[PDB]
Symmetry: C4
Subunit: 331 residues, 4 copies
Amino acid sequence: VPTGGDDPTKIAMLGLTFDDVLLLPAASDVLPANADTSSQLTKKIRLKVPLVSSAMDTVTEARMAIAMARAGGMGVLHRNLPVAEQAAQVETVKRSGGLLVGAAVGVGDDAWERAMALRDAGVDVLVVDTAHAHNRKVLDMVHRLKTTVGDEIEVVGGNVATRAAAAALVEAGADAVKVGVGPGSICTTRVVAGVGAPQITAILEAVAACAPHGVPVIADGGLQYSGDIAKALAAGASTAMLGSLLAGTAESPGELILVNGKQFKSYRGMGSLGAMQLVPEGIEGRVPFRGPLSTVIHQLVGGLRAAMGYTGSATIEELQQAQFVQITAAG
Amino acid sequence: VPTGGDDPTKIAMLGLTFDDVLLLPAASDVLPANADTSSQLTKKIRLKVPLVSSAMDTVTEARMAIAMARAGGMGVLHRNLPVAEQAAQVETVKRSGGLLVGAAVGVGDDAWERAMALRDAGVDVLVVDTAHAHNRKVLDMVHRLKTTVGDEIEVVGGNVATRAAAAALVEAGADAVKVGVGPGSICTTRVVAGVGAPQITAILEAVAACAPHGVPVIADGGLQYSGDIAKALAAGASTAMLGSLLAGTAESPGELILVNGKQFKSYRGMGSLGAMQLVPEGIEGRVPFRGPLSTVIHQLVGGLRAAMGYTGSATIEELQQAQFVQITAAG
Amino acid sequence: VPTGGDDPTKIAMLGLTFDDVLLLPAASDVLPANADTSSQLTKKIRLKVPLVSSAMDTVTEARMAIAMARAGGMGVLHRNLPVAEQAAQVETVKRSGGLLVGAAVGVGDDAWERAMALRDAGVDVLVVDTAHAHNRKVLDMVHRLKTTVGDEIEVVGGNVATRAAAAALVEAGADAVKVGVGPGSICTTRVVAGVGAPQITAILEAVAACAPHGVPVIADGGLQYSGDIAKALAAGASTAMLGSLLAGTAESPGELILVNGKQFKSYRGMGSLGAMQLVPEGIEGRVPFRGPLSTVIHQLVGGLRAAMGYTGSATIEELQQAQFVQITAAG
Amino acid sequence: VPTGGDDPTKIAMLGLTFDDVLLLPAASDVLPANADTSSQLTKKIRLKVPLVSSAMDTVTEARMAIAMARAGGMGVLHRNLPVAEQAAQVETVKRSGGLLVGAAVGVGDDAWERAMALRDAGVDVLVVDTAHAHNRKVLDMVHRLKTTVGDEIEVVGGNVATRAAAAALVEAGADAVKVGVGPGSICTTRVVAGVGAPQITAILEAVAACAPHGVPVIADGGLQYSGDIAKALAAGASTAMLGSLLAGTAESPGELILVNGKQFKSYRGMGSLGAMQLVPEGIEGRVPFRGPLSTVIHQLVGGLRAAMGYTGSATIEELQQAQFVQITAAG
Ligand SMILES: O=C(CC1CCCCC1)N1CCN(S(=O)(=O)c2cccc3cnccc23)CC1
Ligand SMILES: O=C(CC1CCCCC1)N1CCN(S(=O)(=O)c2cccc3cnccc23)CC1
Ligand SMILES: O=C(CC1CCCCC1)N1CCN(S(=O)(=O)c2cccc3cnccc23)CC1
Ligand SMILES: O=C(CC1CCCCC1)N1CCN(S(=O)(=O)c2cccc3cnccc23)CC1
Ligand SMILES: O=c1[nH]cnc2c1ncn2[C@@H]1O[C@H](COP(=O)(O)O)[C@@H](O)[C@H]1O
Ligand SMILES: O=c1[nH]cnc2c1ncn2[C@@H]1O[C@H](COP(=O)(O)O)[C@@H](O)[C@H]1O
Ligand SMILES: O=c1[nH]cnc2c1ncn2[C@@H]1O[C@H](COP(=O)(O)O)[C@@H](O)[C@H]1O
Ligand SMILES: O=c1[nH]cnc2c1ncn2[C@@H]1O[C@H](COP(=O)(O)O)[C@@H](O)[C@H]1O
């Protein structure tokens, strides 16, 4: 074995991230403006824009979830707050129209209580929200929810980085599988635990387990440019979840920060010290202020539409069949 | 599949760019000074120097096209201006001798009108000028032009990044195929759309579709050093189109810019905000002032001649048969 | 042969270091807090925490060895000092409880005398401490020690970077094999001698020779983050030896250094000029002051526990069966 | 073909440079101090230290050639000066003992005259000194010299980067083949001409053509550290030629230069503008002042000896049979 030892499976794969690949152009009759950007968030819920905001306390509360839904995506309300408060934000979103809204729960003891409270508040999607879904407690959580409230509510499970983990969530009854163990911009899991999986390879693997069962994959974390959205979907994902790309917007929680005459907002991991207030697996940082959400979403979607133009993808379903070229460091 | 999923074609290729390879020396009786640098721009038109200036409003207007033609290459007049103006520049070039000149057209409604006007002005080459030629509207444009004015005018089509796209343009009747989707120094297509193809691999693929039909390939974008010109031609291209390398010259449009006591000129993408005055796919930048075109061209050609010396290529046709060594990051 | 010459064995392997790989998540019922971090330092000695401090004069004297043992690891007393002094430090450690302690010896003439003196002082582990164990003098040293004092004392041999070297130490009677030729943070062997072996590949190879004989492998050098500890153990190592990660602690030898208002301590190679007071193979540097050892060890172990959680490893023995994904430069 | 086109030979090889590889340790009974560093410079001439100084006007004139010979290596007198002057330097070296000395000639018209003049002055080695030896004029030069003065003088030919070029020089009668097209620290051939070959791969290939005929290979250019010397010899080279590593010494031509309170000397390519006083293929730069040659040579040789210790090479001939591990960017 060229890299050492006698076991060829020790190093199971070569993991590619977004910067490792480019989308290849293909024959096209598709104009960017006419492309259809709608896509399955879950088995039942289709979004007009395949974008979801992260369940983070510096990204999504009621104001973001409302702006996302109006932009044609959805927001996932974070769970770093009292159950009553989170449910009140759900109500607030519903009060503002017939707007889609999701909300994160854990798998702890009050997790079940929290989910029932969100159900009562009218939530559309429950996201069982962990760093590692391949675990009997998370799988049991997903399943219990699905059997109890599954007719009225769609249940998302995550996160996973492998085929077998995605397969287990499908089996457990997930309406969507969320992919991303370690790729987040504010993530330190890779240096703290030494654990991770580059996101393009992780998506390809999850989609191999999920697509045969008609279960959409949400690509979560590591997206830096609108181009990475196209890449993630082309790898087979149905939507993308964004943290950093949306944390700089007016609608995100938090105040402006002035540093050297430039405008920023705080953006922090939910495994950061501050968020947990111990071995943190996220940092607390800043992102540039980017203005209104509507305008950020317009830009990102514009980039996607261009990609659909280049690749001849009339729909997201077609983009999922596009091909990549692997590039080198020099590229 | 080592990089994920079960489909070996998902990641179709490993894309190499200019920095990925070096030309290997070979047995040589060729002195740089005696090497023959002439090459086909199109099926009928041979240039003394295998270089063409980009169709950009910070690179080529009449003064550049005249200087290029006199240097033994050619200029392609940009189309970001009224038809009457562009045609007047064509006339201006023709007024200055029996000088070759090309001009860009689009595929829009006024595209056809523009081309007829250029024809009337005496243009030698029409370049159908898009970011993605593999499209029925571009292919139909190339063909219509070829059937209508093809006996007096050579028609170039572009840009493509794949074998099938190049094949389609040949079929459509192109007299030359221009290669380059995303490699430009001022390009942001790769981060905005996630789309692209490293240029050495793109040239190899285009040449595989074009050379059997006797159609020359123009390598367009990403050339940073005179060495990249030799590399591009060795990959099988017949000419190279230059933007950044020529934008700093006296003959390019625009005034000098003084920054920190150094001289620059603006150089901007035709998909930049400023050029389009929306989702831009180019930036607006600066390049160092490099002085007279004649001297820049002398240097670039000098580098090519040295390459032809090292590789024993008496002619460009021979250089196209040279071999590469792939290098690593460390090199 | 694609990289040159006709001999496929000239370039024997592709060497991976810690940054080349990530641990893949796997099915897990393991909570970080409940994971069992105990591991074999040698055939007979099991540690509560799989960590050993380096035998360096800026890392381990009596105060460090005591703090390490109390934290559940062990310290290896450096040998850059008179025999009487080193033995007095051994006694000092033993005076402070029933604390495990190891001590380095060379293979010179006074080496044997030194080892007997340490034995008399009550040492638990003798580490035969060289940069290259695959040598008749080192092998004979290990063996002589083992046959003479082997019933009361465990004998460690090192360092090696290949399978055959590890095999020779096992044969010689080593109770543990220490791996690391050139990976140290303060090492210059790779630029001075051009010699080395990336540590993940080196561990895989050593473990292939050592594990079938029940001999534990100590991963020595190159560990920068708590994640590298998990990686090293997953590659098959049983413990890790730390220099740089511990040199900044209160318990290490040396005073604080203030530089630009920040706190540091000196950390230097035992092959550095200063340490030898000639062709040095280490540098003299600084590391940031990190406070009490107990707290540094808590953090590192916390990172390991998280890894064991992600990978479903209940014990270190299970973690040694985990799988990696190879990543690219972009990751 | 994964990198493009249909021709698998288009990209002939994967080229490795010194930083791509490390020497693997092996079983050893060799102490650095007792290792035998002697090696063939040519078929007849053996050196005590396998090092030769470059034929450059900022590296070797009489004072350097004398210091090199005394250190047990040799210097090659540059040819950027009148024949009478170069021959007078040869005499000067001979006047200072029974000291080996070499001298560069070209292949021009006065080349032959120059060589006869050096012969008369008592030169021991003529180095036919080009950037590309695979050329009938260079091959004829080597051969003519060999047939005319070959019994008293050893003739070196260079430079080559391929197996076929090395084979042609052997056939032509070369007593040694010098390898290095483009790797020099002051070289711009790779960006100007796009031509080159990474040096480890180039050595492996040259040695494949030269060693079966008993012809020594001189590794010329790209050596940055004493470790690269060991690497070059392990790849099969018999000596190494150094420019940058020696240009900072007291014995090199040129005065001290003070810049920001630090000491430097000028070091410039013989294809630089200044050296030629046009398309330059070298730059004019600075290197740090390093003091006496004797001390620099001691250090470099010290590094080699350490390598011979690690690899168990008693002699240079044994070191040439050592093995490499390929490393990644991360290493
Ligand atoms: O409880 C733990 C530690 C255990 C988790 C699973 C078993 C192993 C240890 N954590 C809590 C949550 N996360 S996180 O906030 O950083 C996180 C949030 C969502 C998506 C993640 C994707 N990859 C990394 C971290 C992520 C950190 C770790
Ligand atoms: O109309 C569009 C968007 C669509 C284009 C094709 C289908 C997908 C979207 N554009 C207009 C022109 N270009 S460009 O000016 O930047 C451009 C000019 C020439 C060569 C290019 C080579 N690669 C990239 C850009 C290039 C940007 C995009
Ligand atoms: O005596 C020598 C030189 C010879 C050693 C073996 C044969 C070849 C030359 N040295 C003495 C000790 N070391 S070291 O202190 O730097 C060292 C200490 C422990 C672990 C090492 C791991 N890799 C590198 C250096 C290491 C340097 C070299
Ligand atoms: O005459 C020429 C140009 C031709 C040379 C061969 C055919 C192709 C063009 N040159 C003259 C000498 N060299 S050089 O001084 O830079 C040079 C000196 C020795 C070793 C070299 C190794 N690789 C690169 C350059 C080297 C530059 C080029
Ligand atoms: O603290 C953390 N450590 C690691 N991952 C996190 C943390 N907090 C949130 N995440 C995940 O990172 C995603 C956003 O990543 P980003 O868009 O690259 O900034 C989120 O949706 C989470 O899945
Ligand atoms: O705005 C843009 N975005 C992407 N590519 C562009 C743009 N404008 C021009 N190009 C292409 O980039 C080529 C020049 O690239 P350059 O020589 O690397 O600077 C041009 O000839 C175009 O094909
Ligand atoms: O001077 C030196 N040169 C090379 N390796 C050294 C030297 N001194 C100590 N080492 C080794 O480097 C290890 C620590 O490496 P680190 O934890 O990366 O700082 C030590 O345990 C030694 O094996
Ligand atoms: O101007 C130049 N351009 C390219 N190579 C040169 C030039 N001048 C000398 N060389 C070669 O570079 C070698 C030294 O390289 P260095 O030791 O890396 O600095 C010399 O011995 C020459 O073979």
